[PDB]
Amino acid sequence: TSTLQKAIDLVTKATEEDKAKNYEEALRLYQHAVEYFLHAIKYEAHSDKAKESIRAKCVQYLDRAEKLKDYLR
């Protein structure tokens, strides 16, 4: 499985968990998804628009993970 594919897979579930009110599970997946995303742009080659997309979504996923862990703690 491609690194990016895994990133999407992990994030996808993360969103489902967030809806299920699983901030903890969602948070873990969010951090993981981002990791794979960053690894894809670095270890994998992609157009500029692609990188920007990952960098944009990446900051979005993390931000969510941050606030999630913020109030959770």
Partner: peptide, 12 residues
């Protein structure tokens, strides 16, 4: 490239 959008829930 098609990515998902985080769910905007009404959480703290």
């Amino acid at each position: 490239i098609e990515l998902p959008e985080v769910p905007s829930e009404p959480l703290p």
